[model samples]
Target chain A: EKQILCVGLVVLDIINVVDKYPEEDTDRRCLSQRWQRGGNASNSCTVLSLLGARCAFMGSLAPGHVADFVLDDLRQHSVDLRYVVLQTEGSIPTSTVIINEASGSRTILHAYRNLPDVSAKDFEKVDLTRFKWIHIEGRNASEQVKMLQRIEEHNAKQPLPQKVRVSVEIEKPREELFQLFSYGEVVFVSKDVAKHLGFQSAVEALRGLYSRVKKGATLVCAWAEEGADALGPDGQLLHSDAFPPPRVVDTLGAGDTFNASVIFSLSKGNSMQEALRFGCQVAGKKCGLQGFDGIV
Target chain B: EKQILCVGLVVLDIINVVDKYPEEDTDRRCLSQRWQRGGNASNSCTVLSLLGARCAFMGSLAPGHVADFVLDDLRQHSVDLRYVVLQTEGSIPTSTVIINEASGSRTILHAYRNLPDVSAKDFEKVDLTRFKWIHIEGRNASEQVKMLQRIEEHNAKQPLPQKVRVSVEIEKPREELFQLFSYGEVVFVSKDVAKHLGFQSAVEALRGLYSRVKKGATLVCAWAEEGADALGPDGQLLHSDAFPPPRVVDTLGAGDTFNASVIFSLSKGNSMQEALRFGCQVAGKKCGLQGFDGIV
Candidate 1:
């Protein structure tokens, strides 16, 4: 089975559910607390796997307690971990996430610590032929760019039908992330990143970023409640209305769910409009649930 | 060696140090993060061990990654864990603590989860003959009162010289904890608890709580920066000036240091005045450093 491979960071997310957001210098009791495997690419793999796709995750993990929990969660989700490298001397990356039950707002305090990123050399070890689609996080730009170049080289040697499709997610606005634009057949631009780049709306973001992407690539921009907009290879612009749930239960991985749903639909030979609608549908469903489970 | 036994909760404290206190909904990168074993009784044992006393910690802990870290630190500190009960099923209690470097203020969000407390039956297994002092945190009052009664029964069978002296710390304001007031031979009261009870100063708290304690009991109250005041068994009041450090680095375990230092000093036959001075001296030094190391 061809895999939908996600390449990026995997972190231990310590989620503390509080009655309300904490104030400075106060002692509060959390309503509940839990540990979950979290990261953009890691979450995408789980969602893709849940969507009935053969999903694989590629990242570097430290051998410790936090990593044990993270790895166990991935294994429980049935996401393949064949390409994950175990670092000998580093701590697991962790995000202390605070979720307010009363206000439905979230705060994140991330500590990457000493955990090393997956190098281009580690990516070299992955057998690209086994993967049908590769999703990359727009981070560690230098090494990721080289990894993308390697994938391109691999694609150059294969027939068009057998070549791997590449997608990159630009969640943060950084100068180096712009260099990744021309490498992916599909580019995901976050609303925050688009706003930082001076685009007011999802349609405007897709139009502005269209020229920066590959000529025949699909540029997608998701604007939270405003829904999503996508520009196709044939220069066709499509917009999907937000499919919000009755009440938002959690918004933690809604973005990852959106991207994964679109990738899953597109891989199944669905039209861009169909994929965009499915993306919004799945993302909204995810917001109605606490986690990725039972969100087909 | 006769051990100074401490009985209470032991939790995994995830300490995140940020440049400034976080707002309600924002993404922040932590300056540094570390996990440490933390709890009133747990920290007291570590300080007692560091101060060259044979210290033992008695608590209930769930066996998992967090417990592993907590157990490792206790073993490193050479604190005896003979009375610690391993709960068959439950998640480890955790405290997500955020410290602001700019203001030196800390916020704590604690999730006790499903971890059970050490019962009176669990305390029955302890060999009271092996202990010189027993310091209890004024929590789980129902079971702890039973544990204290059991200790009194044991003391009734021993000679005065061989009896285990008992101390209890009252940090929070709770009616159940008031039931513990008459049980301990020595009581360490916090400023917060004292304030909640309508006392304005350390000396006033001591005077207010004097009648509620056991006959000939020593009552100690520590007020931040204002120093500590204690009332001796002979109806003598003693005051010790706060020996603050040049700069307060971390005040996390300062109170525990004070309690442990006083217990250590009194066990070694120091006067109430001398014990109060030693406690202030050590606690001040603790605030000048991070963790329990190098305080002595």
Candidate 2:
């Protein structure tokens, strides 16, 4: 089976579950704490692998203890790490997440330190032909642009039917990341980024961002609880109802799960509407449980 | 040189420095985040090592990524970890600490998980003669009592001049930990614990707890920004003025530094008054620094 490759960050997610948001200068005990592997592309790879896709993750990681946790988690999810760039010194990127038990909301404090992002040169080392789909996280704009250009050059050389499909996720509202819009055949615009651009709903977000999207590309947007919306090259719009669980256990990786599900469905020849629905269903199932197990 | 052994827990401290204490259910960017080795006994060992004392740490650590960080930090400080029991499974103990930049105060949330405490059996593995001073953090009373008993039994067999000196820290106001007072030649009590016992000041705390202390034991108490007081076996009380830093960079490990400095001073045969003054100065210096470096 052709592999699905996810290129982005993999961080140690230190989730501290507190009864309430802590006050300044006051010591308190948390309900529980957990260390898990987390990052948009990283979590997506887990979902993709869990959804029966042969997936690989490529990112820059520091060589140390925290990286061990990230490695263990990726390996456990059957996500290949052969293309990961290992740095000799520096700490791994980490997110100190506070999960408020009463509100079910997560507050994240991210620290990337001096760890470099995965560059175009590193991406070139991969056997591009082995992957049918390549997903790039819209980060480190300068290096990412070159990476997208390389993938574009690779696709141009291959027969149209056999060309590798490219997808890019623009989750942050950085102006530089906006340049990634025309690179991916499938572009995922997050709710946060969408709302940052003045679009209020998923359907509005897709249409609003559609102008900068690649020619003949599909633009996808997911709005929390309200479901997802997508726009095809022909300007046809599709919407899916939110598939919320009875009780939302954790919403941490829901969007990543949705993105992976969409990719998985589309790879299996499902229509964009079907993929959108599947993404919503899978993500809802993910929120109903802790972590990414038993969601399939 | 005889090694000073500190017996207690070592935890991974995830210190996130935020501009202010975050509101509930809100995401914000932190100024910085650091992962350091922490815990009362663990911090004391580092301070002892910095003071040019040959120091060793005895604790239970799970063998994994987090433990690797703890080991690396300890080794970097030249704090021996030969007696640390390596658990086959279970996660390392961790503390999620929030350091508010504006206030310069730290809030800690500790998680020990199911990782067992260092047992009496583990303590028995050490050769008592190598250590001149043994300090224990009053925690896990059941196992702690046995460990103290072992040290007591070892001290009884040695000549008066060669007997190992024992000091125990009663920082928390737990009734069971009071049982440790009769065992230590020196007992250190924290302000919070003293206040909980209805004592208003350091001298009062020393006097209030003096009845429960060993007959010849010296009771010491430290009140934040109020200096420290020590009650000697001869009923003489000594007071030292608080040494205030120009600006408090961090107070996270200040108490541990004071304990280590006092131990270092007393081991060198300094008078109780001198040790108390030295401890105040060193702890104040520690508060002016971000970590245990160049404070000597």
Candidate 3:
């Protein structure tokens, strides 16, 4: 892989399209079903991979039926897996989403206690010098920050040809993820995080997060329907309009689409406004589709 | 094993408890999730095994992870597997059900094909003389009748200590299953079949189906929320009230509980009224729980 590395979970996603949600005491039926690879960082890498970026995933793999499914899915999509850790025995996380065919709304269910995540020690095998960009899913904040610190130390002493650019996703308001804004040159947070942080607007969240990052760093906040807002290194505020697909379908994991497209565009030297526009455009196109496809 | 055999498909069921169904373009979350071994004959065998009956399953097996899961689940529950056929590689059928916790309503999704089913040829190894009672999930009527005829020809030559009593579960109104009533002494049909065959009520369905069966045969029809109705050979029509659980937790596969209870009770020589009562009571207990558990 040439320039990008994604660190997070790799999971199997089973999606069902149903007529409608049934009442508490009745039975209903589904119209269709689909299986696809899913996860925040994993989706991002898939988009990057499709866009012709040489990307590698640092997610851990374990021995299980689901592990076989996830590994095969990623490999088929052409994502690099040289740095994936093989744990003793762990099952891949699976999420079931029921999509309403009439309204195209989706309801998801998954158990979290078992889906494996990356440990800080997993980064030991990842040589940062070989990549130009790294994206971290900021759920396990403390451990991820430590891993970033380790990479920073190595870069300062014996830097490789391509010093890595780091980015972080502050999507979920997990306790640890609140402290990750200072660890990366680029940071992306979701609408849920904005509301959790007491900011009613993505523009406000971007402004609040701008102060937490180093100068010359970019801070972006995705506003659900209105689109996204970002503060560039030049201290200029950039706004990107949302793409409204003709036929709205699944919006379940669209945030990952925006993040990957933004990173992909920015890494290719697009300006902040242009990258946000590209991200919104890509995300808009993703809505009318069933699962994770057509991102590039 | 003692004297019971179950015939049909065995599948792994993945259930998700979600709130209201989402619109066609939005997303929601599930309150809980469960994975269980499910199928008409599979559930019957589990209950039979629990009731101290030496039960053997006759579902065909295809090499795959889901096949492994179904086999392991039956073995763990003490269900005998001597009759399972190991055929070519194929996927075990999986159903994704989204239960609305508020209304206790469930919507299910699964493929119409590919899950392994017992073929008449697959039963070449089964020794019908060893079992006194056999339950068939009447999915493939053509093949099932062939297997039943084989059992009949073999019985004409050498009958067992107890004449083999065959039961058929006509859950789906699939083609060919309509003629299965002639092959089984004890027959079960779902509420769906009532509407499918121009019968307005369960009792009427029972009365209509009684004429289709041989003299001295038992015809049973499950009445939703109203327990079940049965017509014994002596022109006796028995009606049992539905066990309105303290809470109606799950109904997806509760029909199996009723069928198993009916089969188990009748096998022990209970009268039609007594068997219906026992079936409703056991099924009532099953309703308040998820999957096929809690009934003793």
Candidate 4:
């Protein structure tokens, strides 16, 4: 079966609902509680699976309780977990959140203690040729840069059964950000990442990103409410506004949904403009509901 | 610093959100999401810490990602983790749930797997006399039974430096339930657990439990709305009907708060009836909040 390969950090999000944000030194009480399996790549893979895409999630799941949470979540979502590598037991890196009821946005207090950083060695056993499309959520910049280099080398020499399209989701902006764009056929970025990169507008960020991509590569930018837009090599800009449902309780992981839709649609031979529309539709449907998992 | 010690299972509850109960084989989507740290003993210790009692959580945290979640949770609440023991790198037993939105009650689907049963050997280094109170959540019944026997045997030979009050919180009914009552100076149970033991009424369950206790032993039962009540020696019945704060978002760890308050009050030399009232107050406070760490 053809599958979309997703790679990146896997995290267990411990979300606490508090009446208000903690002020200075005073502790605030939690009014409600919940947790979800989250990570940029993992969330995208979940969305892909929910959208009826055959997908395999490749990431390092540390040995211990949190790994179980990650595995169980993948299995529940019908995402293939055969590529998950277990490493270390001391700490499963997590994104802890304190949700503010007044604002409906959360402040993340996270730690990455002792979590195994993904390396090229971990991906040696994975057959890149078996996948139709490879989606990577940028986590460890140096490791990802090295891994992408290895993939480029393999694609050049090996007699692959099928052409693999590489998609990259840039989560952070730094020197490593430039290295990742070189390896991706379609690069996705958020507005915050764009702003951090010193680009005031998404269009400016896309132009800067486009300058670094390989020939014929497309740059996709997902903006909240503004929907999704893509800039193709031919210099055509395609944009679509997300038609979200009437109410949005939580906006977490909407970007992941958009990424999945774009990758799945493009892999199915949809035009770049058509894929952008599909991406917006998927994300808009997600915004109408609550949670990343509730997108479907 | 004096610390309340908690020894028991640390469980990650995977709750599925749904609008209503699903029909057989009918696929339904979750309306929202939530996850919380659970297990009776763990929550009790956490609540005690929140209420300004120095607390230490001593349990077998399975080596791997799941253990990371457990450890991080304890540390976030300022509970000491110096006593946690880690063994193995596989599954940490978990409880999965499918929660109904209409009734707000959960339907548990699966329980823990491959969880190490706590052994007497695991407690060899633990000095029972150091803690003012030792609360054991009775999920791992056999292991708890063995540990209780060992504590009793050690106490028989060497008189403890201080009177360490032992308490057991019973959520699940076991065949050895009668034997557990004799092991603790105070025992706590919920109305559900009492009903499971075939006790038609809370008073009857208290009476039955009181019969198995040694001299001066106390049996506390939590009956929602009716509040909490305890049975003392010579058939002395102490009852308090205290409604917790008006709004209850999650009742997940309310019982743990009750146990923590009762133990904290008793350790401070409060009478059995007064301690029971304290428990009601603490639990009532918890009902207005969420998670074990919100009681303060």
Candidate 5:
């Protein structure tokens, strides 16, 4: 079915729940702990897969015991892994996050030494024109541009309808990530990321982003509690209020859920108004739960 | 500073704390997760090191990243790793324990395919006469007997007044563990293992064990809730009550704390009755905390 293809980092997240984060040089007893599949694009793909979107994953999958869990998780979710680039020598990436029960704040320690990032060379093997939508987690900017060029080359050879509706999530302020934004149709930016890029608010961020984007591309800026603002190529302003739950159990992957939900809805030919509603609600629902385990 | 020498398994333990253990085919969020150095003898050494006892660790130290943590932990604690036998292949042993917050019970899934158990060959590298005390987890039974025989041979060559007091802890009711009991001055067994080997109570277990032990050897059987029982050369049974904490934070390494504490006190030339009291108190303190970072 290959209706969607999600490209990003995939990681094994080991989460520890404690009354509070432990002080340095001392250990604390946790109320609970869990190991689950985690990453921005991974979580988004997971949400889309459960939402009945026929999604495939594209990333650098490294070898090791951690890889076993990651591979099994995607397979169990029925996510097509044909596009994943496997690293034979390196161990997969992992993040150990300590979640404070009282504050719902997470402090993470990540490790990924030998694992390689996905490259344009890796993307060359995949047939990019098959999917209705392509989502990327704006990383390795130069390589991503090469990938975008590759897709354009393929499109020029045998043109397809709607130009494959590309979407990107840029969370980091890294220079490489900044340069890759011109390649996607729908670009999502968080409030902090927007601020980091010299914008004052979500609206300002969206406008600032709109200045750099291709003609008619949509730019979205998400503000945690304030709400979200978007700017269209037609110079229209649209907004969606935040739907924070009464109780927030986990927020680690909530934004990813929102982006995935929105991408998933639009991929089905839904309107921006409906997609905004869809993203807000699903991400709110994700906050009430622990891990994204098929909503149960 | 190498006054105490501890022997047996060393492992990298990944612990997850959950409200309840996850059921089959479902995902559950854990309250917290931790990766630390863990194992029976390794934990015993951890307590021994923090208890201000100069200690050293001996075992089959497998290679790879996990081994780095194990080695670094021992080294950081000032626990001598000179006696450790390094293996060229095989990663260190690992255990993923799912701890239930409500019940304070742990369900462990352990894996150590390439890792080998400590053999007598690994033990022969260390000189036994230097330490006034030696403690073993009683694993690799046949190898343990070989270790005991080697120590005895060394003792026969230059028998001191105490001849390096030896202690053993047996947790499993496995096949080889049964035949390696006669070589230590003190022996400890948990109630479950005693029950598995066909005994109702600690007293009965100690009585059953008395036949194979050398004259004057001490037998101690730990009964979780009811406390513990010990049998001396006079065949008189002694009891030490369990100190159930008002709040039980962690119990994973409680028994190891007891064993190490008892051995430390006994090695300091303390009476058996005093050592029993010391062991119970320190183990009680261990239950009130997570990871034996020294007894209270």
Candidate 6:
């Protein structure tokens, strides 16, 4: 089966409930709480698998009790976990988040302490040619760079029968973002990140990215309810209007789902405009649900 | 520093919040949800450490993302993690609890899937004599038996001036309950377990267990707001009843705190009656707070 391979961090998320973000002196109560396996790449893979896409998650799973949760979560969704490497000693990364009821925004108190990074040697073990699409969450920059290099090397040795498209999801240092763009065939970036990078608009951001990464890649900029605007390979700008659903519950994995839908649609030969619409529809549906477990 | 050593299962607790417990096929909505590191022994150690007790936690932390949350939780409470062993491949046992807001009582969906049992060989690696008290939550009967055998061997060989007091907090199978009684110097049982064993009263339960175990061993039973009742070697039943402060949020770890307080008091040469009162006071204070983190 043709598969979408996602590579990055596999994290355990500790979510705490708060009626409201507490003030300095005053006290607030947590109505209820839970823990689940989550990360940008893992979440995207999970959504893709749920949406009837054959998806595989590749990353480091530190050996411990938490590793079990990660494996069980992936297995439950029928997402392939064959490439996951369980490490000893170092902790599997965790993100502790406090969500506010009034506004769906969450304040994350996280410790990136001892997260595993894949090396060039590790990439040798995987047969990347089998995958139809490769999605990389730019959490581990060095690892992603090494992986992309390996993919380039593999493609050179034996040209893939079907061109395996590469996608990058940026969510860190600006320098790392720029470095990753050089390798992607399709790039997904948030509006906030675009603004941080001093781009006037989503189309302008794509133009800047395209100047350096002149591979004529598909560039998508998600602007939440404002919808996503994209830049096609033919120098044309495509805009997708907002399709807000009934209600907004939690917006945690909306971006990941958007990325999944885009990749899935494109893999099925959907045009860039049609793919952007699918992404927005998926994100809008995700916003209406309680969590990232459901995919449109 | 004198340390309170706790040995048991550390689980990732996934709790779903609902307005009321569902009856028949009536559908209900989950208001919100979250997760935390929870278990009988883990909660006890957390409370003990919070109340200025130098504490060490010994349990199986399966390597991976799940262990990340467990280790972080213990570290946040200043509980020592020197004795915790990271397992190679067992699932970090997870318990999905549904918390009904109206009743305040929880209905749990427990998965005891492939939990690592702490054996006698595992205990050989630790210097048990260094800690003044060893508190064991009897989750695995077979493993607890082997651990007890090892502790007995250590006591027989080195016979220190002040023998390390062993406390077993059991809430499991009836057969394992009997097996645990023979090993622990101080046996702590809940009101529910005592009733399950066909005992007329807590006093009767203690007398029944005392007949099989050592003569001078202490038997402690926690009764929440009714406080705790202790039965000494001389066939005397001592009870301590104290009311906790009014506003109670979640009464989850109150009993665990009571047990830790009793162990803490006894280690300081307090009388059985005094220890009972101290235990109740600690639990009472713990109830006034939100969760186990505020026990101190």
> Candidate 6: lDDT of A67?
79
Best DockQ among the predictions, by candidate number: 1
Best by lDDT: 1
Write candidate 2's Cα lDDT for A1-296 as tens digits.
78999999888888887667777777787888888899889999999999899999998888777788889888898888899999877778777887776666777887736488888888878898989999998889889999889888888899977799999999999989999988888899998999889988887888788999888999999998999999988779999998998877677888899999999999999999999999999999887877887796
Candidate 1 matches the true fold with a TM-score of 0.97
TM-score of 3: 0.87
Best by TM-score: 1
CAPRI-wise, candidate 1 is medium
I-RMSD for candidate 5:
12.5
Candidate 4 ranges beyond 4 A from true positions: A17-32, A98-104, A112-114, A157-161, B1-296
Per-residue lDDT tens digits for candidate 2, residues B1-296, read 78999999888888887767876655667788888889999999999998899999998888777887888889999998889998887877678888776767888887736477888888889998899999999888778889888888887788988899999999988989888888788899989998888999887888788999888999999887889999978889899988989877678888999999999999999998999999999999888778788686
lDDT of 3 by residue, B94-129 (tens): 777766666667666765455556778887778877
- Cα RMSD for predicted model 2: 1.9
Instruction: Tell me the deviation in Å of residue B290 in model 2.
Output: 1.3
Give lDDT: candidate 1, residue B223.
Answer: 94
TM-score of each: 0.97, 0.95, 0.87, 0.55, 0.59, 0.57
Candidate 4 vs 5: which has more TM-score: 5
Q: Candidate 3, after superposition: displacement of residue B189 in Å? A: 1.7
Superposition error at B15 for model 3 (Å): 1.3
Instruction: Pick out the ten consecutive residues of candidate 6 chain B with the lowest summed lDDT.
Output: B20-29
| lDDT value, candidate 6, whole model | 0.74
- In CAPRI terms, where does candidate 6 land? incorrect
Cα lDDT for residue B77, model 4?
Answer: 82
Cα lDDT tens digits, model 5, A1-296, are: 55699889898876666665454213335666666799888888899988988998998876655677788899988899888888777666556555666776655545424267789888888776678788889878888888878766766666556467688888876766887667677888776678888999887787777877767678877776676677877787888887877776677787898899889888888877778877887888777778786453
Per-model CA lDDT versus the true structure: 0.88, 0.87, 0.79, 0.72, 0.76, 0.74
